[PDB]
Amino acid sequence: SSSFSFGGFTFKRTSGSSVKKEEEVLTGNLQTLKIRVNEGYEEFTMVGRRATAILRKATRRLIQLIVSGRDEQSIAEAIIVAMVFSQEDCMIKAVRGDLNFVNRANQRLNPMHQLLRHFQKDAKVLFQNWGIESIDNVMGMIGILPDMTPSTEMSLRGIRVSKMGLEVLFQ
Numbered sequence: 240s241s242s243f244s245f246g247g248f249t250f251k252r253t254s255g256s257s258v259k260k261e262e263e264v265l266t267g268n269l270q271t272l273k274i275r276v277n278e279g280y281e282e283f284t285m286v287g288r289r290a291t292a293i294l295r296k297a298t299r300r301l302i303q304l305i306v307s308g309r310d311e312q313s314i315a316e317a318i319i320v321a322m323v324f325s326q327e328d329c330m331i332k333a334v335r336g337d338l339n340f341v342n343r344a345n346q347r348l349n350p351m352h353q354l355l356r357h358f359q360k361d362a363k364v365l366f367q368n369w370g371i372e373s374i375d376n377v378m379g380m381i382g383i384l385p386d387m388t389p390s391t392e393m394s395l396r397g398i399r400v401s402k403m404g405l406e407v408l409f410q
């Protein structure tokens with residue numbers, strides 16, 4: 240509808256709709272989180288200083304992320320935000336230790352920001368447990384492995400790196 244900020248990226252919804260439904264989820268540390276799950280199919284653009292992306296998602300499901308970034312670190316930053324934003328069970332179950340993050344005032348962060356801060360600290364467990372898949376047509380986009388190196392054979396599930404800037408899909 241209108242643009243919002245998450246993880247250093249401006250997001251804008253380009254199509255679709257969702258409704259919030261409260262769900263209780265267990266983390267990989269058996270901590271209960273109360274998350275307002277977005278239910279529906281939606282498409283987004285993401286813009287950051289060093290990466291842009293197209294995000295297509297459904298209820299707790301990253302269907303596809305196409306990322307264009309300056310370097311491996313910048314691409315990884317966009318992927319992490321997209322994986323948290325997806326609200327996938329896979330991402331919740333990749334949490335290690337308990338989440339009790341607070342802001343500058345002593346106020347507990349909301350669960351989505353708990354998750355974001357967690358995986359922005361270290362995404363290695365998230366990347367290693369997300370899943371990989373074989374990729375075929377590499378003419379327009381290539382794969383990225385859990386170690387953030389390129390591949391023309393495999394990729395993180397639903398993740399592709401564009402061989403071009405993304406104005407063509409933003410238009």
Ligand SMILES: O=C(O)[C@H]1[C@H]2CC[C@H](CC2)[C@@H]1Nc1nc(-c2c[nH]c3ncc(F)cc23)ncc1F
Binds near residue numbers: 249286287
């Ligand atoms: O425009 C904004 O509000 C923000 C949001 C969207 C992208 C940046 C980070 C978040 C942006 N802020 C700024 N970007 C930039 C900027 C430099 N090179 C870039 N390349 C791509 C890009 F996209 C933004 C930038 N410079 C100063 C900024 F202040």
Ligand SMILES: O=C(O)[C@H]1[C@H]2CC[C@H](CC2)[C@@H]1Nc1nc(-c2c[nH]c3ncc(F)cc23)ncc1F
Binds near residue numbers: 326
């Ligand atoms: O839901 C919220 O509390 C906030 C915080 C956590 C993620 C977004 C940015 C901060 C969120 N804000 C917004 N989310 C959404 C939104 C649509 N579909 C989604 N699927 C998963 C998700 F996670 C957030 C969304 N749209 C507009 C927003 F403005």
